[PDB]
Amino acid sequence: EVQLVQSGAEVKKPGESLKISCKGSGYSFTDYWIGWVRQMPGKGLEWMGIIYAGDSDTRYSPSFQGQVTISADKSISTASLQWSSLKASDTAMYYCARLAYDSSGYYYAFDIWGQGTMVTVSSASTKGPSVFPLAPSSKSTSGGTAALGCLVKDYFPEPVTVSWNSGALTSGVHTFPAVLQSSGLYSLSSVVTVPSSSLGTQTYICNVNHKPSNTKVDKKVEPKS
Amino acid sequence: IVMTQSPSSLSASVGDRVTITCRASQTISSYLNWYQQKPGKAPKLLIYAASSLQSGVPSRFSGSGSGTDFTLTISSLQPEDFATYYCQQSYSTPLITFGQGTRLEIKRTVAAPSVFIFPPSDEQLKSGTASVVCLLNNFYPREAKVQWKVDNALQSGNSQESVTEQDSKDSTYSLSSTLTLSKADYEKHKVYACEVTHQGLSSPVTKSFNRGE
Amino acid sequence: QLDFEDVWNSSYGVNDSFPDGDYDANLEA
Amino acid sequence: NCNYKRKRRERDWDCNTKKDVCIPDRRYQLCMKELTNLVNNTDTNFHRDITFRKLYLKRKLIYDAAVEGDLLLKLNNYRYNKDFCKDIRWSLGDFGDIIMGTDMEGIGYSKVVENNLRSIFGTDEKAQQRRKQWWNESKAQIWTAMMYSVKKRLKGNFIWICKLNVAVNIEPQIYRWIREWGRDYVSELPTEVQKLKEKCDGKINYTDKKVCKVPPCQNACKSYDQWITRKKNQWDVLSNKFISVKNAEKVQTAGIVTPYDILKQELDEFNEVAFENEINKRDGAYIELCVCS
């Protein structure tokens, strides 16, 4: 099958160098141009540059010329993108993609895409979160519906997962995007609305896991007295 | 060669017909492609040569135009069609330019948020800092305003906001706003309120509590 | 009027041993 | 529709159609039936299976080369000699420049072929490298298809008169056409001068030259005039194209500096200075056969 496979997500400190790579398979790698594309979190697609794998002819967008180095290794069917010294503004998803032509040979487009490499650049270091309860009360009730939640605070890097009742509770759960605090640490909240009559009768336990710190927490959320 | 897409965002319901335009700063004949991207997914080639469908693309997609004005039409929107669409001139091979994208949002009837306020946990006060959380649940449209007031004084600069994706089942948004104070500032005050302004409310809603339940 | 399947099979991998001829030679069909 | 080939020299080189090159009639009659028809496979995907498009092309090109080799054998009256080998070499070379897109005749069915090839190989800056790579890995198999007919007919008696290494040698189209033209010249020239010595040889009375009165010898000088004037025309534009092509090319050809180098390589008994005289009508035999003085 025709495929581009990019290397894994990267978390780096300002000033480090970094090279991400993209491996082609299922086609003649040296016969096609390979492009590189940046997508900032929440923004659109930015063409960065393109390389012809067969002879390493390389073109850059004006906005990326001199900021980054695109290269290729035919012997291992790999194209690469590298920075000599990362900035926090380089935090973004990076795609490689094959340029190919239509049945007439005149119309070019990006037809095979890699899955993307996420690069996060921060002077923060790995840290597991604290988990605090968002307890339900009379002031978190409308109708006969109560809201409760978990506050997952002060962690890095970005990926933390939240389930409720080991996965048996999924209806009415909202797990918000993380916000990046001024400390360089992330903080998210996960909340679920439940029937107020289920309180004191059904338990609600949020299961928080942050792999990079090997933190696993199960916080039992109770009403307060 | 500059590519301008418009509108940047569009709301429509399943069944609607929608049209997205893309303008080129100079003529490029039919050297225009379109890509679809769903969140957390890689872009997928959808249309090429201005109007040719890629394999597997359902026929309700069509592309039009030649020169500088180009159009993407979806004759009847399907749930899977809500995504972001990018155009891309293929006129200066292999130097590429993209448009800035048009995002398809699911239109829906107005729903007012339900509002809950959460004092900081005693556990967290132990750590030396205090987070007050204000939750706006299941509302539409996305536009909403949260104002924090501590003893009637409007807070500024010490809160942060986060919004979910449109809910898969009811298409609403949920918002979560956190006011961060030092445990010292927190215990120096009594009344904590968040005030919510949204289209579905006749007038703003305040939820509040007194430090010491 | 050629057997084009034979042409195809003949164009590669055949490998028989005919000898070199002098360029001034002259034979007939 | 690949027709029997026209008699050699029935139509001389053509400098009037494209006014920067003289095109041999062999090139005009190059068999391109299958190369011109070829259509798209079923896929409807954006990007097709190029590997299989190239295999489709190889098959089509092998059929056209086989037919060409058959008609070139028939043009030579079914003689397997060096003149046939040269033709096989010239048409293989022309197939090559069509495949690589460096062919000098851009007329009619050749423009359609170029679009068929663009659909297989694409059109970006690098497609030409790709077309050349595929030609180089295919050209010997294409040559073998051109030898299918002689091989098949001679059966047990076949021998390698034509040499594979010589025929697959890549060099610009204009070098190969000069070679072909030099051989055409060397076959017309002794025919054209003996057609003079029929009428103008010796001296009328003992002291006058026959061309100064004898009308059968003046019409023979008028025809050798038309012929040498064409040869001179053809040599000028081909040398112009040679000079234009040479120093507009970076792949150098050690041993070729000017058009005369090519004729010297190709023609046994080539005399550069006798040839320069022959075409400029100042050679020794033209003077005492055709000039009153």
UniProtKB/TrEMBL annotation, chain C:
Subcellular location: Early endosome; Membrane; Recycling endosome
Family: Belongs to the G-protein coupled receptor 1 family. Atypical chemokine receptor subfamily.
Function in brief: Atypical chemokine receptor that controls chemokine levels and localization via high-affinity chemokine binding that is uncoupled from classic ligand-driven signal transduction cascades, resulting instead in chemokine sequestration, degradation, or transcytosis. Also known as interceptor (internalizing receptor) or chemokine-scavenging receptor or chemokine decoy receptor. Has a promiscuous chemokine-binding profile, interacting with inflammatory chemokines of both the CXC and the CC subfamilies but not with homeostatic chemokines.
This protein's name: Atypical chemokine receptor 1
From TrEMBL, chain D:
Pfam family membership, one: Duffy_binding
GO cellular component: membrane
Alphabetical list of InterPro entries matching this protein: Duffy-ag-bd_sf (IPR042202), Duffy-antigen-binding (IPR008602)
Highest taxon listed in the record's lineage: Eukaryota
Domain Duffy-antigen binding: 20-191
GO MF assignments: host cell surface receptor binding
Name under which the protein is recorded: Duffy binding protein
